[PDB]
């Protein structure tokens, strides 16, 4: 027998479910999202960093011109200049005057430090969610990691757990992303070969050690002017460093849904978004026969003063009549309320008590013990503390957000208006017939 | 490398809103984001003592 | 072919694109074997059947 | 002068165009896709055998 249920994709929340393989007594089930690892499919578009403009010592010729032989070096943009007649510490380095020419050669390579602070550009594709789940069912419990796609059985032990697809698909990464020093930024980096001066990606390569370096930097060289040999040149400020100054805020400080962001590999962790469909073919050896399990002849729900809040601010007490002592399962059949406990040692006759948490101001949640069901009913008061260090353990719905008495009032108002217009209709019809019968 | 840890901000709790009292003699980065459908993320370098 | 990349060669700087169609031969899922390639809905990583 | 023209995206086929600039005699401009390399980005999902 396989049970199935939706589970809130909220890390650390011990969401509970009750299985009802009726040939056996109910069994308590908890589906707890220990962690999530939404991993995007990505590739290294290119590495980038602060380029280093190597200006290899210029080639000089003392009796003729020099060809600007092109090179595969990145942003290779060498120029030949006449009338150079350059000096050096000792003196002039050429024979003639105007007949000498000079070739100034410059290109760019990754600065030595780039090995560490290099911005790996990555394209991002629809991330497949993976979650580490801790599952407990009766005294048996197991922990597992299932990729939430809805097809793979990320089974562990005997649990044939299957998860997904997500109720709502969400990826915190934009179509384009960049990683720096373990920080990560959503950013429309220029594609491979799209280098532009003074901007991110001015220098790029398949990998930092690779020779396949391409660059656009507006590097240009001026005609040598000073008496001493020199190669005055200018360039846009290193686009990587320019972006560094104006990087904005990294995604680790900006991703929604509370996603933590981890690098190596890029992934979103412990993110809390939507619901995870779950099915679990629990080993039926885990059930106990309904006749061998305890069962309760009668039970009633008396709920004490309860607070609706994220924590277990509610408390209730259940009287029971039971055939035999043992450990009955206990669970909430109503989505608006969840109990802290999941099982209770129960005697032949006595009073159980349970701590519970709910978001609805009313307590009309059907608590169940050993499968018997009782409607709890009471007003829960608003919480005295505005903030707590724990997420709300349950969602809320408008059908349950309206309070019992407030709901009664609102419906009484609409009932009044509807009944009044009904009276209008009735009197119109009646008066018409009263007149026309004798007209 | 060691980094400092400014005195933990004293929180104040009120209706759907929290007040952070902060104290750092040196520029310190504060970042806040809602865990909802939208991040509404914001970042601010606080200095001195402020709320 | 993005519409920006200057394929500058000698004195000829040139830009090209975008392409008149968003076509691609490769389907979303492909598998390579011995240099052959096949578009095929393979199961994702961690999915084994 | 940034001339602009469409080109039939056909390898080998030599698309011939003419640029017409006021002060100058027209200039023959033949543009040919000698090669093309429609390469999609891809990531290794897994190996199998």
Coordinates of C-alpha atoms in Angstrom, one line a residue:
Chain A
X1 CA 0.0 0.0 0.0
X2 CA 1.3 3.4 -1.1
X3 CA 0.0 6.6 0.6
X4 CA 0.3 9.9 -1.1
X5 CA 0.0 13.5 0.1
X6 CA 1.2 17.0 -0.6
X7 CA 3.9 18.3 1.8
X8 CA 4.7 22.0 2.4
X9 CA 8.2 22.7 1.0
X10 CA 9.3 24.4 4.2
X11 CA 12.6 23.2 5.7
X12 CA 12.6 22.1 9.3
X13 CA 8.8 22.0 9.4
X14 CA 7.7 18.5 10.7
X15 CA 4.6 18.2 8.6
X16 CA 2.5 15.2 9.6
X17 CA 0.1 12.9 7.8
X18 CA -2.0 10.0 8.9
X19 CA -2.1 6.9 6.7
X20 CA -5.4 4.9 6.7
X21 CA -4.6 1.4 5.3
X22 CA -7.9 0.4 6.9
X23 CA -7.1 -3.3 7.0
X24 CA -4.8 -2.2 9.8
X25 CA -5.0 0.5 12.4
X26 CA -3.9 4.0 11.4
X27 CA -0.2 4.8 11.6
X28 CA 1.5 8.2 12.2
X29 CA 3.6 9.6 9.4
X30 CA 5.8 12.6 9.3
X31 CA 7.3 14.0 6.1
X32 CA 10.0 16.5 7.2
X33 CA 12.0 18.4 4.6
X34 CA 15.4 18.3 6.2
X35 CA 17.0 20.3 3.4
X36 CA 16.6 21.3 -0.2
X37 CA 19.1 21.6 -2.9
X38 CA 17.6 23.2 -6.0
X39 CA 20.5 22.8 -8.4
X40 CA 20.4 24.7 -11.7
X41 CA 21.8 23.1 -14.8
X42 CA 24.6 25.4 -15.9
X43 CA 27.8 25.6 -17.9
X44 CA 30.9 27.8 -17.7
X45 CA 30.3 30.3 -20.4
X46 CA 33.7 31.9 -19.7
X47 CA 36.0 32.9 -16.9
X48 CA 36.8 36.6 -16.4
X49 CA 38.9 38.8 -14.1
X50 CA 41.0 41.9 -14.1
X51 CA 43.1 41.6 -17.2
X52 CA 46.8 42.3 -17.2
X53 CA 48.0 44.3 -20.2
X54 CA 51.4 42.8 -21.1
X55 CA 53.4 45.3 -23.2
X56 CA 56.3 43.2 -24.5
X57 CA 59.4 45.2 -25.1
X58 CA 58.9 46.8 -28.6
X59 CA 60.6 45.5 -31.7
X60 CA 62.9 48.1 -33.3
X61 CA 64.3 48.3 -36.7
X62 CA 67.1 50.7 -37.8
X63 CA 66.8 50.6 -41.6
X64 CA 63.2 49.7 -42.5
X65 CA 59.6 49.2 -41.6
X66 CA 58.2 46.3 -39.6
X67 CA 55.1 44.3 -40.5
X68 CA 52.3 44.2 -38.0
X69 CA 52.2 40.4 -38.1
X70 CA 48.9 39.5 -36.4
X71 CA 48.9 37.2 -33.4
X72 CA 46.3 35.0 -31.6
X73 CA 47.0 36.8 -28.4
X74 CA 44.0 38.3 -26.8
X75 CA 43.0 41.8 -28.1
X76 CA 46.3 41.8 -30.1
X77 CA 46.3 45.3 -31.6
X78 CA 49.9 46.2 -32.4
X79 CA 50.8 49.3 -34.4
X80 CA 54.0 50.3 -36.3
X81 CA 55.4 53.8 -35.9
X82 CA 58.0 55.7 -37.9
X83 CA 60.4 58.4 -36.7
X84 CA 60.8 56.6 -33.3
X85 CA 64.6 57.1 -32.9
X86 CA 64.3 56.0 -29.3
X87 CA 67.0 56.2 -26.7
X88 CA 67.8 53.9 -23.8
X89 CA 69.8 54.3 -20.6
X90 CA 73.0 54.3 -22.7
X91 CA 71.8 56.3 -25.7
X92 CA 70.3 56.0 -29.1
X93 CA 69.5 52.5 -30.2
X94 CA 69.3 53.0 -34.0
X95 CA 71.6 53.9 -36.9
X96 CA 69.6 56.5 -38.8
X97 CA 67.0 59.2 -38.1
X98 CA 63.7 58.9 -40.0
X99 CA 64.6 55.5 -41.6
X100 CA 64.1 53.8 -38.3
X101 CA 60.7 52.4 -37.3
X102 CA 59.3 50.8 -34.2
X103 CA 56.5 48.2 -33.6
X104 CA 54.7 48.6 -30.3
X105 CA 53.1 45.3 -29.3
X106 CA 50.5 44.8 -26.5
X107 CA 47.9 42.2 -25.5
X108 CA 46.2 41.0 -22.4
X109 CA 46.4 38.0 -20.1
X110 CA 44.8 37.1 -16.8
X111 CA 46.6 38.7 -13.9
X112 CA 48.3 36.2 -11.7
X113 CA 45.8 36.8 -8.9
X114 CA 42.9 35.9 -11.2
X115 CA 43.4 32.3 -10.3
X116 CA 41.5 33.1 -7.1
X117 CA 39.2 36.0 -7.9
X118 CA 37.8 35.1 -11.3
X119 CA 34.1 35.6 -12.2
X120 CA 32.8 32.3 -13.6
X121 CA 30.0 33.3 -15.9
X122 CA 27.3 30.7 -16.1
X123 CA 24.1 30.4 -18.1
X124 CA 21.2 29.0 -15.9
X125 CA 18.7 26.4 -17.0
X126 CA 15.6 25.2 -15.2
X127 CA 16.8 23.9 -11.8
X128 CA 15.7 20.4 -10.7
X129 CA 14.8 20.4 -7.0
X130 CA 16.4 17.8 -4.7
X131 CA 15.4 17.5 -1.0
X132 CA 16.8 15.5 1.9
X133 CA 13.8 14.1 3.7
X134 CA 13.6 12.5 7.2
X135 CA 10.6 10.3 7.3
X136 CA 9.2 8.6 10.4
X137 CA 6.3 6.2 10.5
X138 CA 5.5 4.6 13.9
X139 CA 8.5 3.5 15.8
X140 CA 10.3 3.0 12.4
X141 CA 12.1 6.0 10.9
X142 CA 14.5 6.6 8.0
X143 CA 16.3 9.5 6.2
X144 CA 16.7 9.9 2.5
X145 CA 17.5 12.3 -0.4
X146 CA 15.1 12.4 -3.4
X147 CA 15.4 14.5 -6.5
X148 CA 12.0 16.2 -6.7
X149 CA 11.1 15.5 -10.3
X150 CA 8.2 13.2 -9.8
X151 CA 9.7 10.2 -11.6
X152 CA 12.8 9.0 -9.7
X153 CA 12.3 6.8 -6.7
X154 CA 15.0 8.1 -4.4
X155 CA 14.3 5.2 -2.2
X156 CA 16.1 4.4 1.0
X157 CA 15.6 1.3 3.2
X158 CA 12.2 0.1 2.2
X159 CA 10.5 3.5 1.6
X160 CA 9.7 3.8 -2.1
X161 CA 9.5 7.6 -1.8
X162 CA 8.9 9.6 -4.9
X163 CA 8.6 13.4 -5.0
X164 CA 7.4 16.2 -7.3
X165 CA 7.1 17.9 -9.6
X166 CA 6.8 21.2 -7.6
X167 CA 3.4 22.7 -7.3
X168 CA 4.9 25.9 -8.6
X169 CA 8.3 25.9 -10.4
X170 CA 10.6 28.7 -9.2
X171 CA 14.3 29.3 -9.8
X172 CA 16.1 32.2 -7.9
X173 CA 18.7 32.5 -10.6
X174 CA 18.1 34.7 -13.6
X175 CA 18.8 33.3 -17.1
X176 CA 22.4 34.6 -16.7
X177 CA 24.4 34.5 -13.5
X178 CA 28.0 35.1 -12.4
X179 CA 30.0 33.7 -9.4
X180 CA 32.8 35.7 -7.8
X181 CA 34.8 34.5 -4.8
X182 CA 31.8 32.4 -3.8
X183 CA 29.5 35.4 -4.1
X184 CA 26.9 35.1 -6.8
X185 CA 25.1 37.7 -8.8
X186 CA 22.2 37.6 -11.3
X187 CA 23.6 39.6 -14.2
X188 CA 23.2 39.8 -18.0
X189 CA 26.8 39.2 -18.8
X190 CA 27.8 39.4 -22.5
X191 CA 27.9 36.2 -24.3
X192 CA 31.1 34.5 -25.4
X193 CA 32.9 36.6 -27.9
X194 CA 30.7 39.6 -27.1
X195 CA 33.4 41.5 -25.2
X196 CA 33.0 45.2 -24.9
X197 CA 35.4 47.7 -23.4
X198 CA 34.9 49.1 -19.9
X199 CA 32.3 46.5 -19.0
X200 CA 32.0 43.0 -17.5
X201 CA 33.4 40.3 -19.7
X202 CA 36.0 42.5 -21.5
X203 CA 38.4 39.6 -21.3
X204 CA 37.1 36.0 -21.5
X205 CA 38.3 32.4 -21.9
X206 CA 37.0 28.9 -21.7
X207 CA 39.1 28.5 -18.6
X208 CA 41.6 30.5 -16.7
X209 CA 44.6 28.4 -17.7
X210 CA 43.3 28.1 -21.3
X211 CA 45.1 29.8 -24.2
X212 CA 41.7 30.5 -25.8
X213 CA 41.6 34.0 -24.6
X214 CA 39.6 36.7 -26.4
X215 CA 39.3 40.3 -25.4
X216 CA 37.9 43.7 -26.3
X217 CA 39.5 46.6 -24.3
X218 CA 39.8 49.6 -26.6
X219 CA 43.6 49.2 -26.2
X220 CA 45.3 51.7 -28.4
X221 CA 48.8 52.8 -28.6
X222 CA 50.1 56.3 -29.1
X223 CA 53.1 57.3 -31.2
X224 CA 56.3 57.2 -29.1
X225 CA 57.1 60.7 -28.0
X226 CA 59.5 61.0 -25.1
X227 CA 63.2 60.8 -25.8
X228 CA 63.5 57.6 -23.8
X229 CA 62.1 54.5 -25.4
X230 CA 58.5 54.1 -24.2
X231 CA 55.2 52.7 -25.3
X232 CA 52.6 55.1 -24.0
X233 CA 49.2 53.5 -24.3
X234 CA 45.7 53.7 -22.9
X235 CA 42.8 51.4 -22.2
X236 CA 39.4 51.4 -20.6
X237 CA 39.5 50.6 -16.9
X238 CA 39.4 46.8 -16.3
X239 CA 35.7 46.0 -16.9
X240 CA 35.9 43.3 -14.3
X241 CA 37.0 45.8 -11.7
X242 CA 34.5 48.4 -12.9
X243 CA 31.7 45.9 -12.3
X244 CA 33.3 45.0 -9.0
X245 CA 32.9 48.5 -7.8
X246 CA 29.2 48.6 -9.1
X247 CA 28.3 45.0 -8.5
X248 CA 25.1 45.8 -6.6
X249 CA 24.0 43.3 -4.1
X250 CA 24.8 39.6 -4.5
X251 CA 21.9 37.1 -4.8
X252 CA 22.8 35.6 -1.4
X253 CA 21.3 38.9 0.0
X254 CA 18.6 39.1 -2.7
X255 CA 17.1 35.7 -3.6
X256 CA 13.4 35.4 -2.6
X257 CA 11.8 32.6 -0.6
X258 CA 14.7 32.6 1.8
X259 CA 16.9 30.6 -0.5
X260 CA 20.3 30.2 0.9
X261 CA 22.8 30.2 -2.0
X262 CA 25.8 27.8 -2.1
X263 CA 28.5 27.6 -4.7
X264 CA 30.6 24.7 -6.0
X265 CA 28.1 23.6 -7.4
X266 CA 25.8 26.6 -7.7
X267 CA 22.6 25.7 -5.9
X268 CA 19.8 27.1 -3.7
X269 CA 19.6 25.4 -0.3
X270 CA 16.9 25.2 2.3
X271 CA 14.6 27.3 0.1
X272 CA 10.9 27.3 1.1
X273 CA 8.5 27.6 -1.8
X274 CA 5.3 25.8 -2.8
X275 CA 4.3 22.2 -2.0
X276 CA 6.0 18.9 -2.8
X277 CA 3.7 16.0 -3.9
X278 CA 4.8 12.9 -2.0
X279 CA 3.9 9.2 -2.4
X280 CA 5.3 6.5 -0.1
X281 CA 4.8 2.8 -0.4
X282 CA 5.6 2.2 3.2
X283 CA 6.4 -1.4 4.1
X284 CA 3.2 -2.9 5.2
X285 CA 5.0 -4.8 7.9
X286 CA 5.0 -1.4 9.7
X287 CA 1.3 -1.6 10.2
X288 CA -0.4 -3.4 13.1
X289 CA -3.7 -5.1 12.8
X290 CA -6.7 -3.0 13.9
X291 CA -7.7 -5.8 16.2
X292 CA -4.2 -6.0 17.8
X293 CA -3.8 -2.3 17.9
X294 CA -5.6 -0.4 20.7
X295 CA -8.9 1.2 19.7
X296 CA -11.1 3.6 21.6
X297 CA -14.8 3.1 22.2
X298 CA -15.3 6.8 22.7
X299 CA -13.4 10.0 22.8
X300 CA -14.4 13.7 23.2
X301 CA -12.4 16.9 22.5
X302 CA -12.2 19.6 25.2
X303 CA -9.8 22.3 24.2
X304 CA -8.3 24.6 26.8
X305 CA -7.4 28.3 26.2
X306 CA -5.7 28.3 22.8
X307 CA -3.6 30.9 21.0
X308 CA -3.3 30.9 17.2
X309 CA 0.3 31.4 16.4
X310 CA 3.3 29.9 14.6
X311 CA 4.3 27.9 17.7
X312 CA 2.2 25.3 19.5
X313 CA 0.2 28.0 21.2
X314 CA -2.9 25.8 21.5
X315 CA -3.6 23.1 24.1
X316 CA -6.4 20.6 24.3
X317 CA -7.4 17.6 26.4
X318 CA -9.1 14.4 25.2
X319 CA -11.1 12.0 27.3
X320 CA -11.1 8.5 26.0
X321 CA -12.6 5.0 26.5
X322 CA -10.3 2.3 25.1
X323 CA -10.4 -1.4 24.7
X324 CA -6.8 -1.9 25.6
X325 CA -3.8 0.2 26.6
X326 CA -1.2 1.0 24.0
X327 CA 0.1 3.7 21.7
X328 CA -2.7 5.1 19.5
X329 CA -1.7 7.4 16.6
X330 CA -3.1 11.0 16.8
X331 CA -3.3 13.4 14.0
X332 CA -5.2 16.4 12.7
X333 CA -7.5 15.7 9.7
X334 CA -7.9 19.5 9.1
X335 CA -5.3 21.5 7.2
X336 CA -5.8 24.5 9.4
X337 CA -4.4 22.8 12.5
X338 CA -1.5 20.6 13.4
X339 CA -0.6 18.8 16.6
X340 CA 2.8 18.8 18.2
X341 CA 2.6 15.2 19.4
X342 CA 1.9 12.4 16.9
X343 CA 1.4 9.3 19.2
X344 CA 0.4 8.9 22.8
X345 CA 0.6 6.1 25.3
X346 CA -3.1 5.5 26.2
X347 CA -4.6 3.6 29.1
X348 CA -7.9 1.8 29.3
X349 CA -9.6 5.0 30.5
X350 CA -8.2 8.4 31.1
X351 CA -7.4 11.9 29.8
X352 CA -4.9 12.6 27.1
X353 CA -3.6 16.1 26.5
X354 CA -2.0 17.5 23.3
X355 CA -0.2 20.7 22.5
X356 CA -1.2 22.1 19.1
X357 CA -0.7 25.0 16.7
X358 CA -3.2 26.6 14.4
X359 CA -3.6 29.7 12.3
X360 CA -7.4 29.9 12.4
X361 CA -9.1 31.8 15.2
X362 CA -11.7 29.0 15.4
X363 CA -10.9 25.5 16.6
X364 CA -13.1 23.5 14.3
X365 CA -10.5 20.9 13.4
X366 CA -11.2 17.2 13.5
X367 CA -8.6 15.6 15.8
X368 CA -8.3 11.8 15.4
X369 CA -7.1 9.2 17.9
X370 CA -6.8 5.6 16.8
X371 CA -8.9 6.7 13.8
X372 CA -11.8 7.8 15.9
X373 CA -12.8 11.4 15.0
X374 CA -14.1 14.2 17.2
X375 CA -14.8 17.8 16.2
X376 CA -13.0 20.2 18.5
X377 CA -14.7 23.6 18.9
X378 CA -13.6 26.8 20.6
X379 CA -12.4 30.3 20.1
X380 CA -8.6 30.9 20.0
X381 CA -7.4 34.3 21.0
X382 CA -4.9 36.4 19.1
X383 CA -1.2 36.1 20.0
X384 CA 0.3 38.5 22.5
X385 CA 3.7 38.4 20.9
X386 CA 4.1 39.9 17.5
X387 CA 7.2 38.0 16.5
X388 CA 8.7 34.6 17.1
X389 CA 11.9 32.9 15.8
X390 CA 10.1 30.1 14.0
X391 CA 8.1 29.9 10.8
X392 CA 4.3 29.5 10.9
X393 CA 3.8 25.7 11.1
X394 CA 0.6 25.9 9.0
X395 CA -1.0 27.9 6.2
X396 CA -4.2 29.8 6.4
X397 CA -7.3 30.1 4.2
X398 CA -10.0 32.7 4.1
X399 CA -12.7 30.1 4.8
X400 CA -10.9 29.6 8.1
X401 CA -9.4 33.1 8.7
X402 CA -12.9 34.6 9.3
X403 CA -13.7 34.0 13.0
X404 CA -16.8 32.0 14.0
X405 CA -18.6 35.0 15.5
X406 CA -17.3 37.4 12.8
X407 CA -18.5 34.9 10.2
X408 CA -21.9 34.7 11.8
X409 CA -22.2 38.5 11.8
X410 CA -21.2 38.9 8.2
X411 CA -23.5 36.1 7.0
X412 CA -26.3 37.6 9.2
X413 CA -25.8 40.9 7.4
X414 CA -26.0 39.3 3.9
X415 CA -28.8 37.1 5.1
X416 CA -30.7 40.2 6.2
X417 CA -30.2 42.0 2.8
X418 CA -31.1 38.8 0.9
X419 CA -34.2 38.2 3.0
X420 CA -35.3 41.8 2.6
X421 CA -35.1 41.6 -1.1
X422 CA -36.9 38.3 -0.9
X423 CA -39.7 40.0 1.1
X424 CA -39.8 42.6 -1.7
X425 CA -40.3 39.9 -4.3
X426 CA -42.9 38.1 -2.2
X427 CA -44.9 41.2 -1.5
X428 CA -44.8 42.2 -5.2
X429 CA -46.1 38.8 -6.3
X430 CA -48.7 38.6 -3.5
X431 CA -50.0 42.1 -4.1
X432 CA -50.2 41.5 -7.9
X433 CA -52.2 38.3 -7.4
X434 CA -54.4 39.9 -4.7
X435 CA -55.4 42.7 -7.1
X436 CA -55.7 40.7 -10.3
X437 CA -57.8 37.9 -8.7
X438 CA -60.6 40.4 -8.4
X439 CA -59.6 42.7 -11.2
Chain B
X1 CA 40.7 35.6 8.7
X2 CA 38.9 37.0 11.8
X3 CA 36.1 39.5 11.3
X4 CA 34.4 41.5 14.1
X5 CA 30.9 40.9 15.3
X6 CA 29.2 44.1 16.4
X7 CA 27.0 43.9 19.5
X8 CA 23.9 41.9 18.5
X9 CA 21.1 44.3 17.5
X10 CA 18.4 44.7 20.1
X11 CA 15.1 43.7 18.4
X12 CA 11.8 45.3 19.1
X13 CA 8.6 43.5 18.2
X14 CA 5.4 45.2 16.9
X15 CA 2.5 44.5 14.6
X16 CA 3.8 43.0 11.4
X17 CA 7.0 45.0 11.9
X18 CA 10.3 44.8 13.8
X19 CA 12.6 47.5 14.9
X20 CA 16.4 46.9 14.8
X21 CA 18.5 49.0 17.2
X22 CA 22.0 48.9 15.8
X23 CA 25.4 49.9 17.2
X24 CA 28.6 49.7 15.3
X25 CA 31.5 52.1 15.6
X26 CA 32.6 51.2 12.1
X27 CA 30.6 50.9 8.8
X28 CA 28.6 47.6 9.0
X29 CA 26.5 46.0 6.3
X30 CA 22.9 45.3 7.2
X31 CA 20.8 43.2 4.7
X32 CA 17.2 42.2 5.0
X33 CA 14.9 40.2 2.7
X34 CA 11.4 38.8 3.0
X35 CA 11.1 35.0 2.5
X36 CA 8.0 35.6 0.4
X37 CA 7.1 35.4 -3.3
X38 CA 9.2 38.5 -3.7
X39 CA 12.4 39.3 -1.9
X40 CA 12.0 43.0 -1.5
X41 CA 15.7 42.8 -0.6
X42 CA 17.5 45.9 0.8
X43 CA 21.0 46.7 1.9
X44 CA 22.3 49.5 4.1
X45 CA 25.7 50.3 5.5
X46 CA 25.0 51.4 9.0
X47 CA 27.4 53.5 11.1
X48 CA 27.4 54.5 14.7
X49 CA 24.2 53.9 16.7
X50 CA 20.8 54.1 15.0
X51 CA 17.5 52.4 14.6
Chain C
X1 CA 25.5 36.3 -34.5
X2 CA 24.1 38.4 -31.7
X3 CA 24.0 41.8 -33.4
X4 CA 26.9 43.3 -31.4
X5 CA 30.1 41.2 -31.5
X6 CA 32.5 43.0 -33.8
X7 CA 34.2 40.3 -35.8
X8 CA 36.9 42.9 -36.6
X9 CA 39.4 41.5 -39.1
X10 CA 42.2 43.8 -40.4
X11 CA 40.4 47.0 -41.4
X12 CA 36.9 45.4 -41.6
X13 CA 34.8 45.6 -38.4
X14 CA 31.5 43.8 -38.9
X15 CA 28.4 42.9 -36.9
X16 CA 25.9 40.3 -37.7
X17 CA 22.4 39.2 -36.6
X18 CA 20.1 38.4 -35.0
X19 CA 19.2 35.3 -37.1
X20 CA 15.9 35.4 -38.9
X21 CA 14.8 32.3 -37.0
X22 CA 15.2 30.9 -33.5
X23 CA 15.7 27.5 -35.0
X24 CA 18.0 24.9 -33.5
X25 CA 18.5 21.3 -34.7
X26 CA 19.2 19.9 -31.3
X27 CA 16.2 19.1 -29.2
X28 CA 16.2 20.1 -25.6
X29 CA 17.7 16.7 -24.7
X30 CA 20.5 15.1 -26.7
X31 CA 23.0 12.3 -26.1
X32 CA 26.3 11.8 -27.9
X33 CA 27.8 8.4 -28.7
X34 CA 31.0 7.7 -30.5
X35 CA 30.6 11.1 -32.2
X36 CA 27.0 10.3 -33.3
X37 CA 24.3 12.3 -31.5
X38 CA 20.6 11.6 -31.0
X39 CA 17.9 13.9 -29.7
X40 CA 16.3 11.8 -27.0
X41 CA 14.3 12.4 -23.8
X42 CA 16.8 10.8 -21.5
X43 CA 15.9 10.6 -17.8
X44 CA 17.5 13.4 -15.8
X45 CA 20.4 12.8 -13.4
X46 CA 19.3 10.9 -10.4
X47 CA 16.5 9.4 -12.4
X48 CA 17.3 5.8 -13.3
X49 CA 14.8 3.3 -14.7
Chain D
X1 CA 30.5 54.0 -43.8
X2 CA 28.5 51.3 -42.0
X3 CA 26.8 49.6 -44.9
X4 CA 24.0 47.3 -43.9
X5 CA 22.5 44.3 -45.9
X6 CA 20.7 41.1 -45.4
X7 CA 22.4 37.9 -46.4
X8 CA 20.8 34.5 -47.3
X9 CA 22.0 32.3 -44.5
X10 CA 23.3 29.7 -46.9
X11 CA 26.9 28.3 -46.6
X12 CA 28.8 28.5 -49.8
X13 CA 26.3 30.5 -51.7
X14 CA 28.0 33.8 -52.6
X15 CA 25.6 36.7 -51.9
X16 CA 26.6 39.6 -54.0
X17 CA 25.7 43.2 -52.9
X18 CA 26.6 46.7 -54.1
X19 CA 27.2 49.6 -51.8
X20 CA 26.3 53.0 -53.2
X21 CA 27.9 56.1 -51.6
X22 CA 27.4 59.6 -52.8
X23 CA 31.0 60.7 -53.4
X24 CA 32.3 57.4 -54.6
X25 CA 31.7 55.0 -57.4
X26 CA 29.8 51.9 -56.3
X27 CA 31.9 49.2 -54.7
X28 CA 31.4 45.5 -55.3
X29 CA 30.6 43.7 -52.1
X30 CA 30.4 39.9 -52.2
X31 CA 29.7 38.2 -48.9
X32 CA 29.7 34.5 -48.6
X33 CA 29.1 32.2 -45.6
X34 CA 32.3 30.0 -46.0
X35 CA 31.4 28.2 -42.8
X36 CA 28.9 28.3 -40.0
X37 CA 29.1 26.8 -36.5
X38 CA 25.7 26.7 -34.8
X39 CA 26.9 25.6 -31.4
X40 CA 24.5 25.4 -28.4
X41 CA 25.8 25.6 -24.9
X42 CA 25.6 22.2 -23.2
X43 CA 26.6 20.6 -19.9
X44 CA 27.5 17.0 -19.2
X45 CA 24.5 15.5 -17.3
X46 CA 26.0 12.0 -16.9
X47 CA 27.9 9.4 -18.7
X48 CA 26.4 6.0 -19.5
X49 CA 27.4 2.7 -21.1

